[PDB]
Amino acid sequence: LICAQKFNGLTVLPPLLTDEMIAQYTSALLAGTITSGWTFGAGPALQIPF
Amino acid sequence: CTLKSFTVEKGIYQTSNFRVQPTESIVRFPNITNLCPFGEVATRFAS
Amino acid sequence: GVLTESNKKFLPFQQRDIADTTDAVRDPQTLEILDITPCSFGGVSVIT
Ligand SMILES: *[C@@H]1O[C@H](CO)[C@@H](O)[C@H](O)[C@H]1NC(C)=O
């Protein structure tokens, strides 16, 4: 699919979230899983070594 | 009009689509002036 | 549609897509190659 479909009414609305923000979310989840534990999924987070 | 209501709640709606209207016409034919009225407007055709 | 310039080898005569929509035409006079592109159109979103 390149351009013929885009020229017969068929449009492709872009996704609401861009790839960079999804990467930022995954980075946040990793940061919480590493430096915090399971606490950050239940409100305020706690810091505890690995 | 699309919602058939008097108070639109909020958000985003897709009413219709816009297209560029054609401007003029482009007629392009090969240049020939030959005629072919071979219908007898004498020979009695055939069977 | 709109007629643009395109440069591809078109030894076969006259006209062509997945949908078989025409993409080039051989001009009956001044034989050259033109390209057909649909008029720009799109959906309208009314944010309120
Ligand atoms: C038809 O048009 C072409 C375009 O180049 C020209 O070469 C040719 O002489 C024309 N034929 C006529 C005027 O009989």
B34 CB within 6 A, ligand 1: no
Question: What's the gap in Å between B32 CA and the centre of ligand 1?
Answer: 9
Please provide the size of chain A in residues: 50
The encoded tokens of residue C37 equal 């592109």
Residues of B with CB below 8 A from C43's CB? 14, 16-17
Method: cryo-EM
Neighbouring C-beta atoms of residue C3, cutoff 10 Å: 13
Neighbouring C-beta atoms of residue C1, cutoff 10 Å: 13
The resolution, in Å, is 4.2
The whole-angstrom separation of Cα A29 and Cα A17 is 17
B31 CB within 6 A, ligand 1: yes
The whole-angstrom separation of Cα C26 and Cα C35 is 10
Q: Does the beta-carbon distance from C3 to B26 stay under 8 Å?
A: yes
Q: Say if strands C41-47 and B12-19 run parallel, antiparallel, or are unpaired.
A: antiparallel
